[PDB]
Design a protein around this ligand. Sequence first.
Ligand SMILES: [Mg+2]
Ligand SMILES: [Zn+2]
Ligand SMILES: [Zn+2]
Lengths: 312, 58, 345, 81, 49, 41
Amino acid sequence: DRPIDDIVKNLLKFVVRGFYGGSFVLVLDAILFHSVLAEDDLKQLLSINKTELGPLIARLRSDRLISIHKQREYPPNSKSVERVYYYVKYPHAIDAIKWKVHQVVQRLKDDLDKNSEPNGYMCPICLTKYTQLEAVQLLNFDRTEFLCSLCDEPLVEDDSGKKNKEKQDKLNRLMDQIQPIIDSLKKIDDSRIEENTFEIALARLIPPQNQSHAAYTYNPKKGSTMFRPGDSAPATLHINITTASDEVAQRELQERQAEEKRKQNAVPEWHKQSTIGKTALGREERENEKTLNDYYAALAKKQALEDEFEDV
Amino acid sequence: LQATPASSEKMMLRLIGKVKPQRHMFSFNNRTVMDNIKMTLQQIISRYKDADIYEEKR
Amino acid sequence: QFLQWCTLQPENCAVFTSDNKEMFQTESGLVVSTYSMVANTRNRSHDSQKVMDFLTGREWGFIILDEVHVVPAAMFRRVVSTIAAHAKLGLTATLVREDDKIGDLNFLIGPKLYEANWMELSQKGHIANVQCAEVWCPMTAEFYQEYLRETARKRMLLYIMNPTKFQACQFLIQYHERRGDKIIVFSDNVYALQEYALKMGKPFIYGSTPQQERMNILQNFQYNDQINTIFLSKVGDTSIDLPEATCLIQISSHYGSRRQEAQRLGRILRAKRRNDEGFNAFFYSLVSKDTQEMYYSTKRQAFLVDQGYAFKVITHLHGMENIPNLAYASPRERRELLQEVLLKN
Amino acid sequence: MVCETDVPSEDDPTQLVSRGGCGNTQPTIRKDGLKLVGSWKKDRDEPELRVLSTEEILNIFKHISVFLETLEHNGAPHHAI
Amino acid sequence: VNVNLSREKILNIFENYPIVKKAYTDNVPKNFKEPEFWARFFSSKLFRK
Amino acid sequence: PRKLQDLGLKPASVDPATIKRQKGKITNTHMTGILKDYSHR
DNA sequence: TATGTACAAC
DNA sequence: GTTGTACATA
Ligand SMILES: [Mg+2]
Ligand SMILES: [Zn+2]
Ligand SMILES: [Zn+2]
């Protein structure tokens, strides 16, 4: 449809397949392949039970990669039921991905910075760590080892003195594996993406089933001023070829039209003549051409249910 | 080309065949898609009507 | 018309009348109102007092006075001093009035810039030609016998309802309706207007008519095929646009105002079919023979004659007797009308 | 019961001035049990009723201008939550 | 909107715009009649180009 | 979105709070039932 | 000055 | 629906 949609979908596909398990790929791809998708229809497509679909939806909703829309449906055969639809709000998901990527990178950066700092001593018996500054005030009279204030036991130097290089590799590994996300985000920022809604998402619907019980339509209540949190987002050309005969007819019609107007515009009798002496106002060539044609032909031969509707 | 009024919750659309005239009635899910299909259909039907009118001229 | 001829968006236009009084919130906009809503001083409604302050507070850049022959009145001239305006323009077809206040316009809005000949624009196809006429309806003896004894204030109602005028008006309306014409009938007397309207079963408009009803009537008279003719009064004597009107008939008239005659004739000078060959609009003035109305009729057309219009006298309507039915055709009906009208007198 | 996105100007009448607002009709908040249920009056007929979740109220109170985990983690349909 | 055409004008269009003739000869007898072609041509972007 | 803007990252969303989702007396009666409502042209 | 008529407001 | 006020003419 549009280049923007393809790149956004690719970013969503990459994130799910890499940072999530397997079933999450199935769930999100189903609602990306289709528009807003009913819960019942989603279960039939993936052939998974409610107990298995629930955990996937909940985790995806937490990260705001999928949005929920509940509305009442009125089928004539059965009583009114509440249906749940799942779709994707690109502005929400993209913002969530950007925040998480920054947080993950920052956390590794902070861990690398923290690791480069001197280690803090820890007490084995009570497992209460002490920083270098805090351990310096625990020195004993003989000044041999730091003694725990509680246990009164020598302190043991903590690990992580050798990990100074491992974390650098981890950050290098992540930035290489996470490169596609950054590249896709750069293009997204360059353009501007419209926020989707249940009604808007329905414009690209590919029905999953033939007789799905869920009526995939948005019929908002009339004049309903109620608002739910996060419920809204920001001629004919006729041609006329005029043949030579038609032009003659048009002239004839013009003459007839002029005659009709002239008769209607005729002055009344009382205005035509000055009425002063009247009483009180109270109360055959065809053979000629054929013989020529025959002669010229001889010359050539010689020489040679009821529902309201409107008309659109 | 019969289309339900925009003031009704239904999004149904019917095409009636020229003569028990053939009727093909379809229900849409989004009004935006319904309008887009309606405009394209109207152009084809209107153009064919003009072509038929021209043919009937002579 | 304003929204049509120029590109001024509706958001910048506001109308200040008795129905609605909202004002434009845009930095610069338009206000179209009436003198009656701007000249009142004694008592103004709380909703209309705010509008007047809104009009007065701002320094307007242009003021247009339509039908400027009423601005030099005793109170209407205050609209020129209260509402500040840099440039004042006055638009009117007739620049005459009975009193001598006409010259007051010199120091109020300014002098007369341009004037156009009526005939010059008539021969160029801009305004429709008119074959004016003045029909002489002889008053019957039964009614005329009371026309002498009665006083002046009661004579007016007595020679306006004479039976012969009813016959003349009905015949002319039928003749022109068969001609596919839109007719307008004027009457300065409200009682005669209603009586004529009910007798012929045709709509009428006058002072007590609400704005919505008269607007609906005018629109129907323009586009509705069934409504061929409508009865107007002093309210529609000027500044009403009826492009479909092509014939005008008068049964009553103000005392001696020459301006009203010209303004009434204006309703038909803008006929849509004013360019088709042989077209001729009509303007009938039904008067009572040997009555004080003839004194005013010869005085009420002293301005049109100046412009070049020629008034001819019709003493008889041909083919008027052969009409099947005529109002007050028998003496019984005529006597009943005399007793009915004299009751009011 | 309305945010009044546009309010009449104090200096001059019939001259509206735009104020920070969203023009959403406010509910008639009532205390049902230990929850706050808001009822909306539709312009054009029972009023719309929904439970004002504490998260919604917490978000709103944070916009005002010094002194269960297991269930929601997996499954737990909205009725259970 | 009604646009009036004439046989002389149709020939003039072909002479002044050879591209129009190219699209005319290869489609009028094969796919759709002449009136449809001109209605489509005016509504197309080529008529604007 | 506010937190993303503080970090210098362009946020592809907006706060929902910013979404601004906001005579009787007839004179003539003898013509009743005859006048069709030509309200528009 | 008196008298019609139309208009705005309460 | 009625009362206080203009405008346009004798
Ligand atoms: Mg005018
Ligand atoms: Zn210890
Ligand atoms: Zn608000």
